[PDB]
Amino acid sequence: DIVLTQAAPSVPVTPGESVSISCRSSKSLLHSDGNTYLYWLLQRPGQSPQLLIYRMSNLASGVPDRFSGSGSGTVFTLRISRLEAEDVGIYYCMQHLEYPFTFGGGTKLEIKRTVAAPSVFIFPPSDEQLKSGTASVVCLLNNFYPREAKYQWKVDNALQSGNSQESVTEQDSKDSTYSLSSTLTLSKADYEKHKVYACEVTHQGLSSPVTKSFNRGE
Amino acid sequence: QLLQSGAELVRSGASVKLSCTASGFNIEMHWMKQRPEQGLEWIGWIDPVNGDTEYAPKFQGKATMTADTNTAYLHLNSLTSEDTAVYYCNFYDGYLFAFWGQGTLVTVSAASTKGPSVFPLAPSSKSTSGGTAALGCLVKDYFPEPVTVSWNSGALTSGVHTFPAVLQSSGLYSLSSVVTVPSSSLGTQTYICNVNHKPSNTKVDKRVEPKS
Numbered sequence: 001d002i003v004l005t006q007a008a009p010s011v012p013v014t015p016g017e018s019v020s021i022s023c024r025s026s027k028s029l030l031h032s033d034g035n036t037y038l039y040w041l042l043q044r045p046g047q048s049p050q051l052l053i054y055r056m057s058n059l060a061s062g063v064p065d066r067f068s069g070s071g072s073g074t075v076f077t078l079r080i081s082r083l084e085a086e087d088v089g090i091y092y093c094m095q096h097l098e099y100p101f102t103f104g105g106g107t108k109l110e111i112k113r114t115v116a117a118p119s120v121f122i123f124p125p126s127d128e129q130l131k132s133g134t135a136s137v138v139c140l141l142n143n144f145y146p147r148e149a150k151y152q153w154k155v156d157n158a159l160q161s162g163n164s165q166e167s168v169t170e171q172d173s174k175d176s177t178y179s180l181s182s183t184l185t186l187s188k189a190d191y192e193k194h195k196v197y198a199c200e201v202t203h204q205g206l207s208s209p210v211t212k213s214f215n216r217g218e
Numbered sequence: 219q220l221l222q223s224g225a226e227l228v229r230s231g232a233s234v235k236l237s238c239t240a241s242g243f244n245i246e247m248h249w250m251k252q253r254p255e256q257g258l259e260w261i262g263w264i265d266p267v268n269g270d271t272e273y274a275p276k277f278q279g280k281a282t283m284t285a286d287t288n289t290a291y292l293h294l295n296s297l298t299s300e301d302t303a304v305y306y307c308n309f310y311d312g313y314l315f316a317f318w319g320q321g322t323l324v325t326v327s328a329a330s331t332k333g334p335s336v337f338p339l340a341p342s343s344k345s346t347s348g349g350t351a352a353l354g355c356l357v358k359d360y361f362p363e364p365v366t367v368s369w370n371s372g373a374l375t376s377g378v379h380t381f382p383a384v385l386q387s388s389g390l391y392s393l394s395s396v397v398t399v400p401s402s403s404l405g406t407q408t409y410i411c412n413v414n415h416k417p418s419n420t421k422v423d424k425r426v427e428p429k430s
């Protein structure tokens with residue numbers, strides 16, 4: 001079938017400025033009735049896709065003027081002018097020509113913004129969870145930019161590894177920051193064998209590394 | 219506006235039928251498949267009135283589409299782990315009015331459905347930031363995906379982060395949903411997370427409170 005190529009990762013853009021995404025194809029992209037059936041779609045994080053431009057260069061319902069599609073032959077381009085922080089998402093190109101309708105590898109649009117230090121929070125295990133056999137300790141790194149951040153779990157000043165797991169939010173649609181959570185899982189007994197639990201965070205936006213901590217029983 | 223009834227858990231080798239109901243029109247539909255962390259893929263096309271159904275090269279023997287006139291149906295069979303994915307039904311009208319459903323997750327696994335435990339991530343304010351304080355809900359040890367978290371029955375949405383679920387080595391899923399909140403408002407105002415895990419018929423309202 002026809003191969004569509006986006007071949008474009010981040011290179012983060014600033015709001016207000018413009019940016020273009022490419023779609024490299026192999027076929028004519030011209031139905032012998034006048035039209036070209038290249039389509040641009042956006043999928044916002046955790047949402048169903050939506051239509052941007054339908055015939056290579058025509059605008060669907062709602063999409064503002066700043067979006068323009070146009071290319072040369074088989075290399076098509078979507079240009080977004082006056083970038084908003086809510087334009088984060090994955091931009092896919094599809095076609096309605098050869099009957100196996102094929103998408104491209106999409107492109108993730110990352111918006112640039114001013115360095116933001118993460119706000120750090122630590123949550124000890126609930127007593128209810130401690131009734132059972134496990135103790136979960138959560139560390140939150142809220143609303144930071146850029147993506148690269150570093151954290152270390154520390155039980156009575158000793159490094160931890162193997163026993164932690166992290167999840168990361170997508171770039172926010174409104175303030176274009178990232179958030180991150182790490183969970184440290186221990187047996188109840190092992191948890192009761194120690195006092196100081198600490199999360200230590202290092203980020204570009206921090207003067208020195210920040211350390212949030214608690215003590216078993218308060 | 220069109221919804222599709224999803225959240226399916228089936229064992230490797232079974233078969234499923236997914237619905238797709240329409241609350242506005244029914245002409246022109248299309249199905250698509252998205253691997254949990256991958257690009258979109260095209261299933262096929264069905265004409266609402268006449269079952270004229272083209273299919274993709276890899277869904278020929280797998281996909282089968284029907285319509286009742288005011289819903290559409292997609293039946294898959296012989297499901298492997300490579301079929302664990304989200305399935306969308308979309309009805310584009312050829313011009314500028316393409317609609318899409320919220321998707322249907324199909325998990326292909328031998329694992330049993332397990333309801334989640336919901337634990338508070340209690341704020342302190344005394345031992346928290348100065349301006350705002352973070353609280354949350356840990357939704358631990360559930361299968362299959364997905365779970366959905368809301369706060370104060372959808373009323374509280376500003377500064378809510380519901381994280382992606384992580385699959386633990388135990389083979390069970392677990393996600394955290396946090397929200398930041400002015401520390402002044404603590405104790406006085408109520409914060410409640412509403413966890414919903416449809417595959418196990420589990421709804422939990424967990425009141426998150428400062429530690430006493």
